[PDB]
Amino acid sequence: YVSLADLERAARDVLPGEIFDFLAGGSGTEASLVANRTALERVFVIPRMLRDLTDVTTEIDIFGRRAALPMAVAPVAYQRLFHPEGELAVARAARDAGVPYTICTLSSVSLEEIAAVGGRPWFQLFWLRDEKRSLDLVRRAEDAGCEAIVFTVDVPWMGRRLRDMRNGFALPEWVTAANFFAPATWESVEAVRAHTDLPVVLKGILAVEDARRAVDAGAGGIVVSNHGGRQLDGAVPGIEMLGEIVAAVSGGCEVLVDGGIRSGGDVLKATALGASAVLVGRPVMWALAAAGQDGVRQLLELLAEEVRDAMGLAGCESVGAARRLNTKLGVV
Amino acid sequence: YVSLADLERAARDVLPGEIFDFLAGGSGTEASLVANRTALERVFVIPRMLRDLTDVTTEIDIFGRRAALPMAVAPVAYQRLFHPEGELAVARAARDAGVPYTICTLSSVSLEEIAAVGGRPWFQLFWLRDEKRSLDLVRRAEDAGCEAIVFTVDVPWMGRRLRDMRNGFALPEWVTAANFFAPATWESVEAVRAHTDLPVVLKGILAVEDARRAVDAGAGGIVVSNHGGRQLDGAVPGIEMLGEIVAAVSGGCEVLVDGGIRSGGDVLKATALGASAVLVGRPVMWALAAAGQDGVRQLLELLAEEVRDAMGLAGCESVGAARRLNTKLGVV
Amino acid sequence: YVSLADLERAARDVLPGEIFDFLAGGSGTEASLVANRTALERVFVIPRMLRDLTDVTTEIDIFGRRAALPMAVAPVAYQRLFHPEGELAVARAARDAGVPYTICTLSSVSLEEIAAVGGRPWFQLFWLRDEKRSLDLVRRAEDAGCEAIVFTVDVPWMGRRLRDMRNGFALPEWVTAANFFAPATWESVEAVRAHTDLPVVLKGILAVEDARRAVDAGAGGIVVSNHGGRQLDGAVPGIEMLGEIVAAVSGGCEVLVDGGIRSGGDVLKATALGASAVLVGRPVMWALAAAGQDGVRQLLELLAEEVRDAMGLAGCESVGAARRLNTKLGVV
Amino acid sequence: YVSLADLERAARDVLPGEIFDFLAGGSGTEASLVANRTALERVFVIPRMLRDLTDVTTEIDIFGRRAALPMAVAPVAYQRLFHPEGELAVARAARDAGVPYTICTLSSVSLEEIAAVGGRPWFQLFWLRDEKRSLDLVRRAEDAGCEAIVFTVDVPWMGRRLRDMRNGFALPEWVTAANFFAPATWESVEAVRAHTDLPVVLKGILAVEDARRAVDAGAGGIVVSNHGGRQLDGAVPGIEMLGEIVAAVSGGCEVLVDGGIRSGGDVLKATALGASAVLVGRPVMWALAAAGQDGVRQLLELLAEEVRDAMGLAGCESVGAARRLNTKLGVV
Ligand SMILES: Cc1cc2cc3c(=O)[nH]c(=O)nc-3n(C[C@H](O)[C@H](O)[C@H](O)COP(=O)(O)O)c2cc1C
Ligand SMILES: Cc1cc2cc3c(=O)[nH]c(=O)nc-3n(C[C@H](O)[C@H](O)[C@H](O)COP(=O)(O)O)c2cc1C
Ligand SMILES: Cc1cc2cc3c(=O)[nH]c(=O)nc-3n(C[C@H](O)[C@H](O)[C@H](O)COP(=O)(O)O)c2cc1C
Ligand SMILES: Cc1cc2cc3c(=O)[nH]c(=O)nc-3n(C[C@H](O)[C@H](O)[C@H](O)COP(=O)(O)O)c2cc1C
Ligand SMILES: [Mg+2]
Ligand SMILES: [Mg+2]
Ligand SMILES: [Mg+2]
Ligand SMILES: [Mg+2]
C-alpha cells in the first residue's frame, strides 16, 4: 500500500456490499460526504524552505499525554462488521503506533476489553435514556483507564442513511452492542463535566458560537466535524469552519477536525488551518477489513511516513510549526 | 420512496414523453432550470448542537392559519395531464397533510370543486383581458373559501418552452381550463388589493426593489421565484436573491421562495436563508403521476420526515430557529 | 429552427469540414473561444416585474440611424466560402430585418456591390500597407453609402489558427478578396478620423484605458471584443470587461460587445451589462450555409423574437430599460 | 509540430511507460501537478491595442547576459533516460536558440562536457553531505563557465512519486550521475553566496517571506515553483504566488516562475503576472525524446514564434511592456 486509496480498493473487494455501504455512506444525497473531500482538495499549502529539519518530529501532547502523530482513530461503531477481531485489532495497532484509539459506546467488544489492550484509549459517549445511566458509562470508561470522554453532540438521533434503507441493512446476529438514547443538551455536558476529572471533548461542533460555548462549558477540546457526512445532509464540512473556530477559541481548548482525511498531506492541511490533531475514520476500517491488525498497522505506518514527508517538505520540524503555515484556496 | 428522486423516476416511467417534458422543461437553454438546483447545492448549513428538542415542531402560521410544514403546493396548471383525478387528488392529500394547496387559474377542475375538498386552498391568479373579468375570478376564489390570492407577476406572456415546441405539444381534448390574458402591472395589483380582504401574494419577484415595492403596495407576501426556470431563461434563481430580499423587506411581508426544492434539507436551506416557507411544484406532480392521491400523501409524509430530521439535526425546535441558522457557500 | 443551435447543426451537416473549421475555430488552445461562452453562461439577469409593456420596442438609434434590434452582423471574411451568394445573401436578409451589416475589407464580393443592396451597411477596415491605400478604401466605403467605419484594432497580424494549420486550409480558387497589410496604431486611427465624417468604431478593445483613449481619439464607438477567440489565445472575453469599460467611458461613445452571442437572452445579458448593441458572427454564417438568404432571414426573425421575449419577461419596454437591469454572477 | 501538445503525444509513443511516468508524474495524488495547469488556465490577459510594433523583441537581459526569449530550460535530471545524446542534445539546441540551459547536479553527462557545448549554461545545485563537497561542485561549475548557481531549495529530500513506486522504477545501468545529500538551510545559501561571484538563484520559493528573505540573503534571483508538483503534494502553484511575491521583492532580485508553461501564451501570462522569465521542464524532454537535438530545436522555435505572436497581439514590443499588462481571473 502506497496510499490510503489502495486500502479502500482492498476493502471493497472483501466486504459484503451492504457492509461496505454502511461504512462508506452518508445521509440524504451525500452532499456533505462529498463536500468533505471537495473542501480538502481546494486547500493548498504555502510551504516554507531552508529551515532546520535535523530533528523533525510528528509528536504532539494532547490531553496530558504524548501521541506519535497529530491523529487519533475516530469512533466507528460495530467494528466486528469489518473483521472478526474488530475493535481489538484496531486498538492493538493504534497502541503499537502511538496513536490514541476512540472506544465507541456502540462497540462490538466491551470497552473494558478494548481498554485492556493498553495504549491511549479515549471513550466516545452517546447520551443515554437518563443521566444516571449515561454517567455510569462515563464512570466505567474512567475506571478502565480511558483518558478522555469524547461526547458526541451531533446525534440527537441518527441521520437518514439511504444506502442502508435501500439495502435493508441490519446488524448480523453475531454483532452486538457489547457495552449493553436521548438527545444531549448543554445540561448533559455539564453533568458529564461535573462527574469526571477526564477532559471532555465535544465531537460534532460546527458553529463558531458553539465552539465558544464549549470552552465556556469547560470542554477540554472539540472536534469540528459533520460526522463524516452521516448526520445533517448539507452540513458544512468541518475543515471549512476550522479557521474561524480556531480564531474564536483562541487557545481555550484543543481544536480537532475530522472528515475526509485521506493522506499525510491532508493532515498537514488540517494543521495549517489550525487543528491540534485530526481524527481518521473510514480508512482505518478499510485497513481492518483488508488485513486485520496488520492492515491497520500498515495504514498507520503509511500515514506516519506521509505526515513526516509533508511536514519536512513544508519546512516544519514540529506540528506547532505546521500550524503556523499559511494556505491559499484554489479550484479543482 | 426514500427520496423525492425516487418519485421522479417513477413518474418518468408512467407519463408519455411529451407530458413529462411539459412538466420537466424550462425556457430557452434551461439555464435557469439547472441553476435552481446548482444554487441550492452550493448552500451549506451551519447546524447548532445541544439545544432542547423535546417539542420539535415544523408548524408555522401564515396568512392567518396554521400549516403543518413551512411549505405549500405550488400552482401547476392542468393537473389532469398527470393523473385522471388531477387537482382533486393533490388537494385531498395536501389537506390531509396540513399543507396549503394553490389552485391554478388554469386548473383542469373548477376552483369551486377543488375548494370543496377543504384544507387550506389558496388561489393563483393570472391577469385576464380586462379588470372586471380578473376581479370576478378573485371574487369566485374568495366566495369559495380560498385564503390567499397568489398573483403571478412574472408572466406578461408565457416563456418559450423549446421541449414543447419540438414535441408539438398540445393539450389533449380531455383536458381543459375548467375555470372558463393581458400583462399585469402595479395598477393591476392595486385593483386586486382594493377588491379583496384576502392577503395578496406576488409570485415571481426577483429584484430587491420589486420586493420593497410589493410591501409598499400592500402585499401580504411575495414568492421569490424564477417560475421554475420556465419564464426568462437566464433569470437568477430565487434562492440567490432571497437573503437580500429578506433584509430589504425587514418583516413587512411574508417572503416565500420556490424553485428546485427537492428535500427537507432544501427546505432547511431556504429557511436558513430567511424564507417564511417554500413552494414545491414538480415533485408533487411526480407523486401524482406515480400513484395519484396516495402518491402525493407519501411524498408529503416523506417531506415532513425530512424537514423534521433536518431541523432537529440542525438544533432547531421551530421554524423560527431555523431562520436564525447561518449558511456558508461551497463548491459542487 | 427554434434556437441558434439548430442552425449550427444544420451548417455542420452541409459545409466541408475544413470550411466549418475555418468558421468555428479560434487561436491556440481555443481558451478564449470557449471563455466567450463560459462568461455569458455565468451571467444571470435580475428581471423586473409589473411594468408597462404596451409598446415594447427592440429598436435603437446608433450612428445616426434606427436599427430594428440592438444588433449588427459582425464582419466575417470570405462569405462565399459558406454559400454561393455569400455577402449578398447576408446583406439582403440584414436589410430586410432592419439590422446593420458590416462589409469586410476581405469580402468575397466587392464593397460597392454589397452596399448597393441597400439597408444600413457599415464598413470594416484593416489597415493596409500605406496610409494612402488605407484611406482610399475608407473613401470607397463612404462614397458607396456606408454609414460607419469599423476599424479592426486587434489584428496587427492574424492569430495562429491551429485547425487551419492542421487542415492545410487554403481559399478555393473561386473565392477571392474582391475589394483588391500593416499593423494599425493610434496614428492610423487619427488618419482615418481626419479623412472621414463617418463615425469611426474601434473593434477589438479590451483594456479600460484603451476604451478611454478611444473616446479621447474621437471614436464614435468601440466594440469590446476578443475577435471571437481568434486573435490572442488567453485574451479576456469582451463580456467580462464590458461593465468596467461602460463605466469608464461614461457615455462618451457607443459601447458594443461581441463574442458568443447565441440567443436573445444573451443580447439581454449584454445590454444589462451596459452594451449599446452586440455583433453576431458565426451564427449568421451558420444560417447562410444552411439555407442562404432565407436562412439568414429565419435566424434574424428568431433572434428578434427571442430579444422581444427576453426584454418583456425582464420588464423592459425599451433597450434603454434593459441597460438599467442588474445582473448577478453564478456558477455553471 | 504546431503546439507543445504535439510533442507530448510523440514522446508518449516512443518512451517506455515507466520512463514516461518518471517524467510526467508528480508526488502523492498529483494535486499540485494538475493545479499548475489549472492555475494558468484561469488567468486571462487584458491585451493592449494600437501600439508601435515595428521592433518587437522577445529578448531580455538576465544575470548579466542577453537571452533570446524570457525562458530557460529547467533542470531535469538524467536526460539520457529520454534520448542517447541526453543533455548534450538539449544544451546544443538551447545554445543555438539563445536560451539558457540549466545543468543538473544529477546530469547523466558531466557538467564540464555540457558546459563545453557553449551557450549560456547555468548550474543547478543540490546540497551535498557536507559544505566542502557542495562548494567544490559550485567551484567546478564556475570554473567551467556556468553563469548562475540555481540552488534548489525545495528538496530536503525527494517527494513520494507513486507512479515510480508502482512501476518499481530504477535507473538503467546505462544511466548514471555523471558528476560523481543533506537538507539545505539558510546557512547553506550563505556558504554558497560567500564562495562564488556568480548570481545565486533560489529555486522552489513559494512563501512571500521566503522571497523577501532570499533578497536579504543576497540572492540574485528566485524561481517561484512547486517543483512541477513533484515535491509537496498540495503545495500552491508558483503562478498563484507570483504576483504577491513580485510586489514584496519590489525589484530586489529577478523573479522567475515555472510549472506547467506549455505555450507562448503561458509565457505571456507569467510575464503579465510579473515574472522576469520562466523555466520550461517537461516539454523540453518531450522534444528530446521525440527527435533528439532537432526536436528540441523545433520546440524552441515554436515557443519563440508563440511568444512573439502573443506579445504582439497583446500590444507589447518588449518583455518589459508585457510585465505591465493586466490580467483577470476567469473560470474553466
Ligand atoms: C460507519 C461509521 C460509524 C460511525 C459511528 C460513530 C459513532 O458511533 N459516534 C461518533 O461520534 N461518530 C461515529 N462515526 C463518525 C466518525 O467518528 C468520524 O466523524 C467520521 O468517520 C470522520 O470521517 P472519515 O475520516 O470517516 O471521513 C461513524 C462513522 C462511520 C463511517
Ligand atoms: C408544468 C408547470 C406548470 C406551471 C404553471 C404555473 C402557473 O399556471 N402559474 C404560476 O404562477 N406558476 C406555474 N408554475 C410554476 C410553479 O408554481 C413553481 O414556481 C415552480 O414549479 C417551482 O419550481 P419546482 O418546485 O417546480 O422546481 C408551473 C410550473 C410547472 C412545472
Ligand atoms: C471566420 C471568421 C472571420 C472573421 C473575419 C473578421 C475580419 O475580417 N475582421 C474583423 O474585424 N473580425 C473578423 N471576425 C470576427 C468577428 O467580427 C466577430 O468579432 C466574432 O465572430 C464575434 O464572435 P461570434 O459572434 O462569432 O462569437 C471573423 C470571425 C470569424 C469567425
Ligand atoms: C523528471 C524531472 C526531473 C527533475 C529534476 C530536478 C532536479 O534535479 N532539480 C530541480 O531543481 N528540479 C528538477 N525538476 C523540476 C524542474 O526543474 C521544473 O521545476 C519543473 O519540471 C517545472 O515544471 P514543467 O515545466 O515540468 O511543468 C525535475 C522535473 C522533472 C519532471
Ligand atoms: Mg477524517
Ligand atoms: Mg421548489
Ligand atoms: Mg457575438
Ligand atoms: Mg514550466
Side-chain angles (χ1 to χ4, degrees), chain C residues 212-236:
Chain C
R212 284 193 197 95
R213 184 159 182 180
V215 179
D216 293 330
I222 60 180
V223 191
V224 180
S225 174
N226 69 13
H227 207 112
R230 297 171 69 83
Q231 285 300 102
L232 174 68
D233 186 42
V236 64

PDB file of all heavy atoms in Angstrom, chain C residues 212-236:
ATOM      1  N   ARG C 212     -10.959  54.372 -22.896  1.00  0.00           N
ATOM      2  CA  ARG C 212     -10.886  55.805 -22.627  1.00  0.00           C
ATOM      3  C   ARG C 212     -10.149  56.524 -23.742  1.00  0.00           C
ATOM      4  O   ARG C 212     -10.593  57.574 -24.221  1.00  0.00           O
ATOM      5  CB  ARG C 212     -10.152  56.068 -21.312  1.00  0.00           C
ATOM      6  CG  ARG C 212     -10.901  55.801 -20.063  1.00  0.00           C
ATOM      7  CD  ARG C 212     -10.120  56.426 -18.903  1.00  0.00           C
ATOM      8  NE  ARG C 212     -10.537  55.887 -17.619  1.00  0.00           N
ATOM      9  CZ  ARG C 212      -9.935  54.878 -17.001  1.00  0.00           C
ATOM     10  NH1 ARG C 212      -8.874  54.298 -17.550  1.00  0.00           N
ATOM     11  NH2 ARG C 212     -10.395  54.456 -15.832  1.00  0.00           N
ATOM     12  N   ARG C 213      -8.996  55.982 -24.157  1.00  0.00           N
ATOM     13  CA  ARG C 213      -8.235  56.619 -25.224  1.00  0.00           C
ATOM     14  C   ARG C 213      -9.020  56.653 -26.530  1.00  0.00           C
ATOM     15  O   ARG C 213      -8.899  57.608 -27.303  1.00  0.00           O
ATOM     16  CB  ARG C 213      -6.892  55.916 -25.415  1.00  0.00           C
ATOM     17  CG  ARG C 213      -6.031  56.605 -26.432  1.00  0.00           C
ATOM     18  CD  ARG C 213      -4.565  56.272 -26.277  1.00  0.00           C
ATOM     19  NE  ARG C 213      -3.821  57.022 -27.277  1.00  0.00           N
ATOM     20  CZ  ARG C 213      -2.506  56.980 -27.436  1.00  0.00           C
ATOM     21  NH1 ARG C 213      -1.766  56.211 -26.653  1.00  0.00           N
ATOM     22  NH2 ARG C 213      -1.942  57.708 -28.388  1.00  0.00           N
ATOM     23  N   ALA C 214      -9.836  55.626 -26.792  1.00  0.00           N
ATOM     24  CA  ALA C 214     -10.684  55.646 -27.979  1.00  0.00           C
ATOM     25  C   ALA C 214     -11.610  56.860 -27.979  1.00  0.00           C
ATOM     26  O   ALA C 214     -11.784  57.517 -29.014  1.00  0.00           O
ATOM     27  CB  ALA C 214     -11.492  54.347 -28.060  1.00  0.00           C
ATOM     28  N   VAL C 215     -12.237  57.156 -26.836  1.00  0.00           N
ATOM     29  CA  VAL C 215     -13.087  58.342 -26.741  1.00  0.00           C
ATOM     30  C   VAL C 215     -12.266  59.601 -26.991  1.00  0.00           C
ATOM     31  O   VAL C 215     -12.659  60.478 -27.767  1.00  0.00           O
ATOM     32  CB  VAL C 215     -13.799  58.398 -25.378  1.00  0.00           C
ATOM     33  CG1 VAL C 215     -14.660  59.657 -25.292  1.00  0.00           C
ATOM     34  CG2 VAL C 215     -14.651  57.156 -25.147  1.00  0.00           C
ATOM     35  N   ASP C 216     -11.104  59.701 -26.329  1.00  0.00           N
ATOM     36  CA  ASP C 216     -10.236  60.865 -26.499  1.00  0.00           C
ATOM     37  C   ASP C 216      -9.787  61.023 -27.942  1.00  0.00           C
ATOM     38  O   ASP C 216      -9.562  62.148 -28.408  1.00  0.00           O
ATOM     39  CB  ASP C 216      -9.013  60.731 -25.585  1.00  0.00           C
ATOM     40  CG  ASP C 216      -9.367  60.801 -24.109  1.00  0.00           C
ATOM     41  OD1 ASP C 216     -10.350  61.489 -23.760  1.00  0.00           O
ATOM     42  OD2 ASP C 216      -8.652  60.173 -23.302  1.00  0.00           O
ATOM     43  N   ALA C 217      -9.631  59.911 -28.656  1.00  0.00           N
ATOM     44  CA  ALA C 217      -9.207  59.909 -30.048  1.00  0.00           C
ATOM     45  C   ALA C 217     -10.324  60.271 -31.015  1.00  0.00           C
ATOM     46  O   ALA C 217     -10.063  60.362 -32.217  1.00  0.00           O
ATOM     47  CB  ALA C 217      -8.643  58.535 -30.418  1.00  0.00           C
ATOM     48  N   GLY C 218     -11.549  60.470 -30.534  1.00  0.00           N
ATOM     49  CA  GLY C 218     -12.645  60.861 -31.397  1.00  0.00           C
ATOM     50  C   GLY C 218     -13.451  59.716 -31.964  1.00  0.00           C
ATOM     51  O   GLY C 218     -14.263  59.936 -32.874  1.00  0.00           O
ATOM     52  N   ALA C 219     -13.264  58.500 -31.462  1.00  0.00           N
ATOM     53  CA  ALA C 219     -14.098  57.391 -31.901  1.00  0.00           C
ATOM     54  C   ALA C 219     -15.557  57.636 -31.544  1.00  0.00           C
ATOM     55  O   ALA C 219     -15.883  58.122 -30.455  1.00  0.00           O
ATOM     56  CB  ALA C 219     -13.628  56.087 -31.251  1.00  0.00           C
ATOM     57  N   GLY C 220     -16.439  57.287 -32.475  1.00  0.00           N
ATOM     58  CA  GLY C 220     -17.860  57.285 -32.199  1.00  0.00           C
ATOM     59  C   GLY C 220     -18.352  56.045 -31.489  1.00  0.00           C
ATOM     60  O   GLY C 220     -19.464  56.037 -30.952  1.00  0.00           O
ATOM     61  N   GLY C 221     -17.541  54.998 -31.468  1.00  0.00           N
ATOM     62  CA  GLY C 221     -17.915  53.779 -30.772  1.00  0.00           C
ATOM     63  C   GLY C 221     -16.715  52.866 -30.667  1.00  0.00           C
ATOM     64  O   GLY C 221     -15.664  53.098 -31.278  1.00  0.00           O
ATOM     65  N   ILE C 222     -16.882  51.825 -29.850  1.00  0.00           N
ATOM     66  CA  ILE C 222     -15.918  50.738 -29.736  1.00  0.00           C
ATOM     67  C   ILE C 222     -16.695  49.432 -29.726  1.00  0.00           C
ATOM     68  O   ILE C 222     -17.877  49.400 -29.361  1.00  0.00           O
ATOM     69  CB  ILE C 222     -15.018  50.843 -28.474  1.00  0.00           C
ATOM     70  CG1 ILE C 222     -15.866  50.818 -27.195  1.00  0.00           C
ATOM     71  CG2 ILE C 222     -14.157  52.098 -28.530  1.00  0.00           C
ATOM     72  CD1 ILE C 222     -15.026  50.912 -25.910  1.00  0.00           C
ATOM     73  N   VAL C 223     -16.041  48.354 -30.147  1.00  0.00           N
ATOM     74  CA  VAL C 223     -16.558  47.004 -29.948  1.00  0.00           C
ATOM     75  C   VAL C 223     -15.616  46.306 -28.984  1.00  0.00           C
ATOM     76  O   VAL C 223     -14.441  46.073 -29.296  1.00  0.00           O
ATOM     77  CB  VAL C 223     -16.699  46.205 -31.252  1.00  0.00           C
ATOM     78  CG1 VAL C 223     -17.493  44.910 -30.985  1.00  0.00           C
ATOM     79  CG2 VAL C 223     -17.371  47.031 -32.352  1.00  0.00           C
ATOM     80  N   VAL C 224     -16.127  46.005 -27.803  1.00  0.00           N
ATOM     81  CA  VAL C 224     -15.388  45.280 -26.779  1.00  0.00           C
ATOM     82  C   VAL C 224     -15.410  43.810 -27.179  1.00  0.00           C
ATOM     83  O   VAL C 224     -16.486  43.206 -27.278  1.00  0.00           O
ATOM     84  CB  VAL C 224     -16.028  45.515 -25.405  1.00  0.00           C
ATOM     85  CG1 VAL C 224     -15.260  44.761 -24.331  1.00  0.00           C
ATOM     86  CG2 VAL C 224     -16.084  47.019 -25.102  1.00  0.00           C
ATOM     87  N   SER C 225     -14.234  43.250 -27.477  1.00  0.00           N
ATOM     88  CA  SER C 225     -14.178  42.032 -28.276  1.00  0.00           C
ATOM     89  C   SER C 225     -12.792  41.413 -28.177  1.00  0.00           C
ATOM     90  O   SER C 225     -11.793  42.136 -28.179  1.00  0.00           O
ATOM     91  CB  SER C 225     -14.454  42.399 -29.742  1.00  0.00           C
ATOM     92  OG  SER C 225     -14.287  41.291 -30.609  1.00  0.00           O
ATOM     93  N   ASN C 226     -12.740  40.078 -28.108  1.00  0.00           N
ATOM     94  CA  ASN C 226     -11.501  39.341 -28.313  1.00  0.00           C
ATOM     95  C   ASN C 226     -11.463  38.668 -29.682  1.00  0.00           C
ATOM     96  O   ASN C 226     -10.729  37.694 -29.882  1.00  0.00           O
ATOM     97  CB  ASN C 226     -11.182  38.391 -27.145  1.00  0.00           C
ATOM     98  CG  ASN C 226     -12.135  37.214 -27.042  1.00  0.00           C
ATOM     99  OD1 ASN C 226     -12.908  36.938 -27.955  1.00  0.00           O
ATOM    100  ND2 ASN C 226     -12.073  36.497 -25.918  1.00  0.00           N
ATOM    101  N   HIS C 227     -12.237  39.188 -30.635  1.00  0.00           N
ATOM    102  CA  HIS C 227     -12.207  38.698 -32.018  1.00  0.00           C
ATOM    103  C   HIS C 227     -12.678  37.245 -32.081  1.00  0.00           C
ATOM    104  O   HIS C 227     -12.123  36.418 -32.811  1.00  0.00           O
ATOM    105  CB  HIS C 227     -10.807  38.872 -32.634  1.00  0.00           C
ATOM    106  CG  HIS C 227     -10.784  39.011 -34.137  1.00  0.00           C
ATOM    107  ND1 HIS C 227     -10.421  40.183 -34.770  1.00  0.00           N
ATOM    108  CD2 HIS C 227     -11.035  38.115 -35.126  1.00  0.00           C
ATOM    109  CE1 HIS C 227     -10.455  40.005 -36.083  1.00  0.00           C
ATOM    110  NE2 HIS C 227     -10.814  38.757 -36.326  1.00  0.00           N
ATOM    111  N   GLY C 228     -13.703  36.919 -31.293  1.00  0.00           N
ATOM    112  CA  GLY C 228     -14.234  35.565 -31.313  1.00  0.00           C
ATOM    113  C   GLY C 228     -13.231  34.515 -30.904  1.00  0.00           C
ATOM    114  O   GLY C 228     -13.347  33.357 -31.323  1.00  0.00           O
ATOM    115  N   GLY C 229     -12.241  34.888 -30.094  1.00  0.00           N
ATOM    116  CA  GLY C 229     -11.216  33.955 -29.669  1.00  0.00           C
ATOM    117  C   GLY C 229     -10.250  33.551 -30.755  1.00  0.00           C
ATOM    118  O   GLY C 229      -9.596  32.516 -30.630  1.00  0.00           O
ATOM    119  N   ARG C 230     -10.147  34.346 -31.820  1.00  0.00           N
ATOM    120  CA  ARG C 230      -9.306  34.040 -32.974  1.00  0.00           C
ATOM    121  C   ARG C 230      -7.962  34.761 -32.967  1.00  0.00           C
ATOM    122  O   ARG C 230      -7.115  34.471 -33.824  1.00  0.00           O
ATOM    123  CB  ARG C 230     -10.065  34.401 -34.261  1.00  0.00           C
ATOM    124  CG  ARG C 230     -11.329  33.575 -34.429  1.00  0.00           C
ATOM    125  CD  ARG C 230     -12.206  34.071 -35.570  1.00  0.00           C
ATOM    126  NE  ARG C 230     -11.665  33.884 -36.923  1.00  0.00           N
ATOM    127  CZ  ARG C 230     -11.755  32.755 -37.621  1.00  0.00           C
ATOM    128  NH1 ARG C 230     -12.300  31.669 -37.093  1.00  0.00           N
ATOM    129  NH2 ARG C 230     -11.292  32.727 -38.872  1.00  0.00           N
ATOM    130  N   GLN C 231      -7.741  35.695 -32.029  1.00  0.00           N
ATOM    131  CA  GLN C 231      -6.542  36.518 -32.022  1.00  0.00           C
ATOM    132  C   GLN C 231      -5.656  36.053 -30.881  1.00  0.00           C
ATOM    133  O   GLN C 231      -5.048  34.981 -30.982  1.00  0.00           O
ATOM    134  CB  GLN C 231      -6.906  38.004 -32.081  1.00  0.00           C
ATOM    135  CG  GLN C 231      -7.363  38.427 -33.471  1.00  0.00           C
ATOM    136  CD  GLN C 231      -6.280  38.195 -34.504  1.00  0.00           C
ATOM    137  OE1 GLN C 231      -6.324  37.222 -35.268  1.00  0.00           O
ATOM    138  NE2 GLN C 231      -5.287  39.072 -34.513  1.00  0.00           N
ATOM    139  N   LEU C 232      -5.553  36.788 -29.777  1.00  0.00           N
ATOM    140  CA  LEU C 232      -4.725  36.313 -28.668  1.00  0.00           C
ATOM    141  C   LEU C 232      -5.453  35.203 -27.919  1.00  0.00           C
ATOM    142  O   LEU C 232      -6.541  35.423 -27.378  1.00  0.00           O
ATOM    143  CB  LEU C 232      -4.388  37.456 -27.712  1.00  0.00           C
ATOM    144  CG  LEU C 232      -3.647  37.049 -26.429  1.00  0.00           C
ATOM    145  CD1 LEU C 232      -2.229  36.559 -26.734  1.00  0.00           C
ATOM    146  CD2 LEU C 232      -3.610  38.198 -25.433  1.00  0.00           C
ATOM    147  N   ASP C 233      -4.857  34.008 -27.886  1.00  0.00           N
ATOM    148  CA  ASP C 233      -5.397  32.907 -27.100  1.00  0.00           C
ATOM    149  C   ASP C 233      -5.067  33.172 -25.636  1.00  0.00           C
ATOM    150  O   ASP C 233      -3.890  33.249 -25.265  1.00  0.00           O
ATOM    151  CB  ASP C 233      -4.799  31.579 -27.569  1.00  0.00           C
ATOM    152  CG  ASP C 233      -5.421  30.380 -26.883  1.00  0.00           C
ATOM    153  OD1 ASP C 233      -6.650  30.376 -26.716  1.00  0.00           O
ATOM    154  OD2 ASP C 233      -4.676  29.428 -26.544  1.00  0.00           O
ATOM    155  N   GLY C 234      -6.096  33.330 -24.809  1.00  0.00           N
ATOM    156  CA  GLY C 234      -5.932  33.802 -23.444  1.00  0.00           C
ATOM    157  C   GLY C 234      -6.406  35.222 -23.230  1.00  0.00           C
ATOM    158  O   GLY C 234      -6.427  35.680 -22.080  1.00  0.00           O
ATOM    159  N   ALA C 235      -6.799  35.932 -24.290  1.00  0.00           N
ATOM    160  CA  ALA C 235      -7.427  37.237 -24.117  1.00  0.00           C
ATOM    161  C   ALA C 235      -8.762  37.091 -23.399  1.00  0.00           C
ATOM    162  O   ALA C 235      -9.574  36.211 -23.712  1.00  0.00           O
ATOM    163  CB  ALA C 235      -7.664  37.904 -25.475  1.00  0.00           C
ATOM    164  N   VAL C 236      -8.973  37.969 -22.427  1.00  0.00           N
ATOM    165  CA  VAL C 236     -10.216  38.023 -21.652  1.00  0.00           C
ATOM    166  C   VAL C 236     -11.421  38.164 -22.587  1.00  0.00           C
ATOM    167  O   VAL C 236     -11.331  38.848 -23.623  1.00  0.00           O
ATOM    168  CB  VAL C 236     -10.142  39.190 -20.652  1.00  0.00           C
ATOM    169  CG1 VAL C 236     -10.049  40.541 -21.361  1.00  0.00           C
ATOM    170  CG2 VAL C 236     -11.318  39.160 -19.672  1.00  0.00           C
TER     171      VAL C 236
END
